[PDB]
Design a protein around this motif. Structure first.
Motif, PDB file in Angstrom:
ATOM      1  N   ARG A   3     -48.029 -10.377  61.521  1.00 48.98           N
ATOM      2  CA  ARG A   3     -47.415 -10.430  62.958  1.00 48.98           C
ATOM      3  C   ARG A   3     -46.879 -11.845  62.941  1.00 48.98           C
ATOM      4  O   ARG A   3     -47.214 -12.748  62.113  1.00 48.98           O
ATOM      5  CB  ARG A   3     -48.363 -10.530  64.161  1.00 48.98           C
ATOM      6  CG  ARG A   3     -48.275  -8.303  64.332  1.00 48.98           C
ATOM      7  CD  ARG A   3     -48.897  -8.770  65.595  1.00 48.98           C
ATOM      8  NE  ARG A   3     -49.603  -7.564  66.580  1.00 48.98           N
ATOM      9  CZ  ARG A   3     -49.441  -7.084  67.309  1.00 48.98           C
ATOM     10  NH1 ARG A   3     -49.870  -7.887  68.247  1.00 48.98           N
ATOM     11  NH2 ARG A   3     -49.462  -5.466  68.619  1.00 48.98           N
ATOM     12  N   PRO A   4     -45.729 -12.293  63.244  1.00 47.35           N
ATOM     13  CA  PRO A   4     -44.746 -13.737  63.149  1.00 47.35           C
ATOM     14  C   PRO A   4     -45.861 -14.663  63.997  1.00 47.35           C
ATOM     15  O   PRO A   4     -45.692 -15.792  63.142  1.00 47.35           O
ATOM     16  CB  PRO A   4     -43.369 -13.443  64.457  1.00 47.35           C
ATOM     17  CG  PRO A   4     -43.671 -12.316  65.076  1.00 47.35           C
ATOM     18  CD  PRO A   4     -44.436 -10.800  64.403  1.00 47.35           C
ATOM     19  N   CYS A  11     -54.428  -6.065  62.301  1.00 52.47           N
ATOM     20  CA  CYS A  11     -54.035  -4.732  62.054  1.00 52.47           C
ATOM     21  C   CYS A  11     -54.358  -4.009  63.323  1.00 52.47           C
ATOM     22  O   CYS A  11     -55.076  -2.944  63.165  1.00 52.47           O
ATOM     23  CB  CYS A  11     -54.026  -4.631  60.288  1.00 52.47           C
ATOM     24  SG  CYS A  11     -53.866  -6.110  59.575  1.00 52.47           S
ATOM     25  N   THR A  12     -53.300  -3.326  63.574  1.00 49.46           N
ATOM     26  CA  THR A  12     -53.562  -2.215  64.692  1.00 49.46           C
ATOM     27  C   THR A  12     -52.406  -0.804  64.601  1.00 49.46           C
ATOM     28  O   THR A  12     -51.536  -0.627  63.246  1.00 49.46           O
ATOM     29  CB  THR A  12     -52.924  -2.974  66.361  1.00 49.46           C
ATOM     30  OG1 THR A  12     -52.597  -1.841  67.308  1.00 49.46           O
ATOM     31  CG2 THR A  12     -51.524  -3.321  66.459  1.00 49.46           C
ATOM     32  N   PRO A  17     -50.063   2.842  60.184  1.00 46.01           N
ATOM     33  CA  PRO A  17     -50.890   1.245  60.382  1.00 46.01           C
ATOM     34  C   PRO A  17     -49.515   0.356  60.164  1.00 46.01           C
ATOM     35  O   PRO A  17     -48.073  -0.203  59.399  1.00 46.01           O
ATOM     36  CB  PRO A  17     -51.455   1.364  58.827  1.00 46.01           C
ATOM     37  CG  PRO A  17     -50.934   2.712  57.908  1.00 46.01           C
ATOM     38  CD  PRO A  17     -49.866   3.145  58.300  1.00 46.01           C
ATOM     39  N   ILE A  18     -49.732  -0.506  61.030  1.00 46.32           N
ATOM     40  CA  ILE A  18     -49.457  -2.358  60.820  1.00 46.32           C
ATOM     41  C   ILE A  18     -50.419  -3.423  60.317  1.00 46.32           C
ATOM     42  O   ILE A  18     -51.510  -3.986  60.977  1.00 46.32           O
ATOM     43  CB  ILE A  18     -48.887  -1.928  62.069  1.00 46.32           C
ATOM     44  CG1 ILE A  18     -47.758  -1.231  62.541  1.00 46.32           C
ATOM     45  CG2 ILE A  18     -48.000  -3.317  62.309  1.00 46.32           C
ATOM     46  CD1 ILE A  18     -46.258  -1.084  61.672  1.00 46.32           C
TER      47      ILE A  18
END
Length: 18
Positions: A3-4, A11-12, A17-18
């Protein structure tokens, strides 16, 4: 995944997946 902000990178959402 990733994330930024570089203080809370995790990772959520397993679908998709992210």
């Amino acid at each position: 995944c990733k994330r930024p902000p570089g203080f809370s990178p995790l990772c959520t959402k397993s679908i998709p997946p992210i």
